[PDB]
Ligand SMILES: O=C(O)CCc1ccc2c(c1)OCO2
C-alpha cells in the first residue's frame with residue numbers, strides 16, 4: 001500500500017521507502033519529480049531552487065532536509081515550503097539514512113581535493129554519498145543545485161556522468177543581497193564591519209567579469225585590487241578555471257572563484273568570465 | 277526502442293545509451309528486466325544465472341559482457357583473462373537470451389578513473405587483502421551497469437561469495453532499487469566449482485583440484501561436532517592433496533562482517549594449483565543446526 005499523498009499540501013515523509021514509494025507512484029501519474037536537496041535553515045537562495053523546480057510543467061517538488069553529519073529551523077523551514085507550494089518534504093533521521101552506519105561511500109575524483117577540499121579533504125565524499133543516496137531514494141527527473149557552491153555543482157555533474165545516473169542536473173544562479181553579497185546562512189554571523197567588508201568578494205568578481213575584455217590577467221588583477229581594498233578579508237584562494245574547473249583555456253568561457261575568512265566566518269563566491 | 281529490438285532473437289548492443297533506451301522502453305511496456313553481469317568466458321555456472329533470470333515471469337534478460345579493467349591489478353592479469361566471445365554469443369542464442377550488452381572500455385570509462393565506489397572494510401579482507409583496489413573496481417563497474425540497464429533484479433553466483441556480499445552492501449548503502457539474487461555454485465560431477473579459471477588446470481592439477489570441494493563438504497558434515505572439527509576436517513583433506521597450496525581457509529559468519537560466527541557460517545577457501553588461484557565456499561551450520 002502506497003503512503004498517503006495529499007495533492008497541493010505539504011506532505012512530510014521521514015521514511016526513505018515512503019518518499020521512494022510516493023515518488024514512484026507520482027511519476028506513473030505523469031508528474032515530473034524535481035528534487036531540491038537542502039540542509040534546512042532555508043533562505044531566499046533555497047527558494048530560488050524551489051521556484052526553478054516549480055516551473056517545470058507537471059513538476060512535483062521534493063525538498064529534502066538532511067544534515068549529513070558526513071559533510072536548523074524545522075517548523076519554520078516547513079512553513080516556508082508550505083508558503084512556496086512545495087508538495088513533499090523528505091526529512092529522514094541520520095539512522096534512516098545510515099541504518100548500517102558508514103560503509104560503502106562515494107570517492108570523488110581529484111577535483112574534490114582542490115579549492116574547498118583544501119581545508120575539508122573529506123567534505124565532498126560526504127556530499128556525493130548523501131546526494132547519490134537521495135537520488136536513488138527519490139529518483140527525480142531533475143535535481144537542483146545552486147551555483148553558489150560551484151565546485152559542489154561540478155562534482156555532482158561528475159558523479160552523474162561517471163556513474164551513468166539518469167537525472168538532469170540543473171544549476172541555479174546565486175541569489176544576492178542588494179549590494180551583491182551572495183546569499184548564505186553564514187552571512188548572519190558577520191558583524192557590521194565584516195558585513196560591509198564582505199561586499200568586496202562580489203565587487204571583485206563583477207569587476208573581473210568586466211575587466212575580462214582586457215584578458216585573463218587584467219580580470220585577475222582587478223579582482224585582487226578590490227579584495228586588497230577591504231580590511232579583515234583573508235583570501236584563501238582566487239582562481240580562474242574553465243567551466244568544469246580544469247585549467248582556464250587561453251580564450252573562451254571560465255569561472256572565477258574566491259573564498260575568504262572574515263573573523264571566523266568563511267565566505268565563497270564565484271562568477272562566469274568570458275575571456276576577451 | 278530508440279535502436280532496433282527484435283524479440284525472440286539475441287540483440288547485441290555496445291552503446292550504453294542503446295541498451296539503456298531499450299531497457300527503459302521494455303520496462304515501460306511491462307516486461308521485467310533481469311541483469312546478468314559477466315566478464316564473458318561463459319560456462320555452465322553463468323548459464324544457471326541466465327536460467328534463473330529466464331524463469332522470472334515476463335522477464336527480459338540482459339547479459340552484460342565486459343572484462344572490467346578497474347578490478348584487475350597491474351601485471352598481465354587483464355591481458356590474460358580468457359576472451360571467448362564467439363562461444364559466449366552462441367551460448368546466449370542457445371539459451372534464448374534477447375539482449376547481450378557488450379560495452380567498450382572507452383564507453384564505460386570515457387574519463388578514465390574519476391568518481392569511484394569505495395567499499396566498506398570487508399573489501400580489505402580475504403580476496404581484497406593483497407588486492408586492495410579489487411572490490412572498488414567491481415562495485416564501481418556493477419554500479420554503472422545497474423544505472424545503465426536499471427534492472428528489476430540482478431543475478432550473481434555464490435561462487436564468488438565475498439563479491440556477492442559486497443554487492444548486497446552496495447545495493448543497501450546506496451539505496452539501489454534492484455533486488456540482488458544469489459545463485460548456488462554450479463559444480464562439475466566430482467564437486468569442482470565451475471569457473472572460467474578451470475581451463476588453466478593441466479590434468480594433474482584438475483585431479484588435485486577436487487580437494488577444495490571435498491574439504492568443504494567434509495567440513496560441512498563434520499560441523500555437528502563444532503567449528504574446530506569442521507576446520508580440521510577441511511584442513512586434513514587439503515593437506516592430503518598433491519600440489520595444493522592453501523592461501524586461506526576461514527569460517528565466518530554468513531555476512532562475513534564484524535560479527536562472531538553463531539549457528540550459520542560460511543567456510544571459504546582459496547588455493548593455488550601451479551599459477552591458478554581457485555576459490556570455493558560452502559554454507560556451514562554449527563553443532564545443533566546440523
Ligand atoms: O547557504 C549556503 O551557503 C548555500 C545555499 C545556497 C545559497 C545561495 C543560493 C543558493 C544556494 O542557490 C541560489 O543562491
Ligand SMILES: O=C(O)CCc1ccc2c(c1)OCO2
Nearest residue numbers: 321433435461462470471472
Ligand atoms: O567464472 C567464475 O569464476 C565466476 C562466474 C561464476 C562461476 C560459477 C557459478 C556462477 C558464476 O554462478 C553459478 O556458479
